Design a protein around this ligand. Structure first.
Ligand code: ATP
Ligand code: ATP
Ligand code: MG
Ligand code: MG
Lengths: 161, 106, 107, 161, 54, 54, 53
């Protein structure tokens, strides 16, 4: 009875036709949501490069210093006060600007890197002040040598000045 | 990790590798008293090669060694050379730690 | 050092009455050699044997580790004659830990 | 069969035509949200300047003092009681008003700065009472010298009075 | 750190230094014990006042 | 801080001062030990009562 | 997890799990009868919904 009686019962109501018209709408909506996730995942896996740096590495220090230096004309900075000893023998306040947390864009080596200064989530970490801060270098392409070049240049700049 | 010596350490209640695999110290680079190194190597290799002699008699299959003497005479260097020769690793245990308990030691 | 199996480490000790030029000479030497100085305080509170080994194992390359006023870390003389070399400090460091960190198996 | 049979099956229901009409609505809606984020990001990156100040820096103290002094007629203040020693030799209560957390607007150097007194999030910080309070100087433009001038004037005012 | 970030044009004032550490008979004795409350040591103060990183 | 923010027109009352710190034979002895419960020192009290920041 | 019944039942779930394919690893040292010890790779059903017959 559930098969035959319902089919007649559904066919009786013209609102049923609109409902199964809406049923297809719901199925398509779920498919469209699924299509988005798979497309994003495939695009990330095949055409983007990502390099996360934790706060537990000296690489974090060098890369943060290099981001402070090479930031082009970034206008999302944060202040960092330090005492700089002049060659005259005295010390004066030095106003240094570090890119504040957010999404910044650079044009290193003809690409458009999408650095992001990750903030503090739960204030748990070791060997530091426990802020769990991080940076994520995202760029469009398939070559990995760009991030290696960035890291090597950061090390060289750290060994410089 | 071959051609080098791995050194583990106690991290909580597990043995985790400490640093990178250290380069092996040649056994002949440690000069001990005449025949001492050969005696110790032969003893430890005899222990390793014969587990059946222990099982057939119920003796626990364990061994322990003690090197004693005035400082700087070659105890730690000989241990490193022996670990290199036997292709073993070294698990450094610090008895006078703060997190070490009897159950954790067991 | 490699061809003879000797560990590639060295240590120096400068001793004398105060104010005769130990710390100043260390600074001048670090400047001359273009090295950096890693200041280590043995009588700290957070310093343990494992932490000391790790710190000595991750020192920056081309740097001088500086343990200044070593005699204040542990009891001495009459205690050195006595059976234990007591740690007259604040943290969880021991004489054996320092000895094995300076020249041990994992150094 | 999935290709041919469904196409006939979809074409059978006139509600399907409205369904794909709604499908285009959903696709346009998702595009519209994406268009908003990219527009905001581009506008912030190209035509706005931001200067965040943490509570871990002395610049925070100087900038907070300068915000207390130069606030125009701001009417979102908070009280701060202190004992002020008069020149007569006695001490009397001093009622000092500091801008309470919120969005305040100033007209420094012909611009419209959008200072914001960030509040406490989780009571974690160091070298202070651990409130993790902050200020964010936001303004429209491309020049960075305005914030440097603000910081220098804050330092001068701190060295004054 | 505190001695390294003192405000410019300021005088650091360590009042009653003799109360920080044991003295006289203890000064003759091997250790200069810290008769204090925190985790400061005689060597730490000596190196802070005039050391390598001062 | 407490001595610096006392209400105006008020008398700060430190009753039984002799019980805060060791005395007599200890006063002759090198340290004036704090026979108390908190983290107060003789030099701290001396500088609070009449010091530079008083 | 406050009962020894938990331990026994977890062991029985490890043993009788049919061909469950939602497992989790558990490394242990197993002493062979030859006298030496080798690593033993034991699989325990990972958290989730499993069905038995
Ligand atoms: N018999 C030896 N042959 C070669 N080198 C030796 C010998 N004994 C000591 N040395 C050298 O002495 C130094 C330290 O020796 P080692 O660490 O083995 O001494 P030890 O007596 O075990 O002391 P400790 O227990 O304090 O480590 C190293 O440079 C090591 O090469
Ligand atoms: N040979 C020297 N030439 C120049 N200045 C010196 C010399 N020896 C000491 N001084 C001066 O003495 C002061 C402190 O010296 P330094 O810190 O090197 O002494 P020290 O031997 O390490 O003593 P301490 O352990 O008490 O610090 C500095 O002002 C330094 O310039
Ligand atoms: Mg040894
Ligand atoms: Mg010195």
């Amino acid at each position: 009875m559930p098969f035959s009686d319902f089919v007649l019962a559904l066919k009786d109501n013209p609102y049923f036709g609109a409902g199964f018209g809406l049923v297809g709408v719901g199925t398509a909506l779920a498919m469209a949501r699924k299509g988005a996730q798979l497309g994003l995942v495939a695009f990330r896996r095949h055409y983007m490069i990502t390099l996360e740096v934790p706060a537990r590495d000296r690489s974090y220090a060098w890369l943060l210093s290099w981001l402070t230096r090479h930031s082009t004309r970034t206008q999302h900075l944060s202040v960092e006060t330090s005492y700089l000893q002049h060659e005259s023998g005295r010390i004066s306040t030095k106003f240094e600007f570090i890119p504040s947390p957010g999404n910044h864009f650079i044009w290193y080596q003809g690409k458009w890197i999408r650095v992001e200064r990750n903030r503090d989530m739960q204030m748990v970490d070791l060997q530091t002040g426990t802020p769990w801060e991080s940076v994520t270098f995202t760029a469009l392409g398939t070559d990995r040598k760009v991030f290696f070049n960035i890291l090597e240049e950061a090390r060289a700049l750290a060994l410089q000045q | 990790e071959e051609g080098k010596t791995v050194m583990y350490t106690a991290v909580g209640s597990e043995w985790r590798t400490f640093g990178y695999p250290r380069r092996r110290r040649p056994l002949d680079s440690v000069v001990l008293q005449q025949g001492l190194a050969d005696r110790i190597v032969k003893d430890i290799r005899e222990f390793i090669d014969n587990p059946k002699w222990y099982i057939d008699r119920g003796i626990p299959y364990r061994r322990g060694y003690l090197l004693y003497g005035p400082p700087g005479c070659g105890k730690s260097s000989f241990i490193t050379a022996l670990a290199g020769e036997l292709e073993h690793s070294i698990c450094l245990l610090s008895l006078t730690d703060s997190s070490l308990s009897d159950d954790r030691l067991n | 050092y490699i061809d003879r199996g000797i560990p590639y480490r060295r240590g120096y000790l400068l001793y004398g009455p105060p104010g005769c030029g130990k710390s100043s000479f260390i600074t001048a030497l670090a400047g001359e050699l273009e090295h950096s100085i890693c200041l280590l305080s043995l009588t700290d509170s957070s310093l343990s044997d494992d932490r000391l080994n790790h710190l000595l194992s991750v020192a920056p390359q081309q740097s001088l580790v500086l343990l200044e006023d070593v005699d204040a870390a542990f009891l001495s003389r009459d205690l050195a004659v006595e059976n234990p070399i007591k740690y007259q400090g604040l943290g969880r460091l021991t004489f054996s830990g320092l000895l094995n960190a300076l020249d041990g198996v994992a150094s």
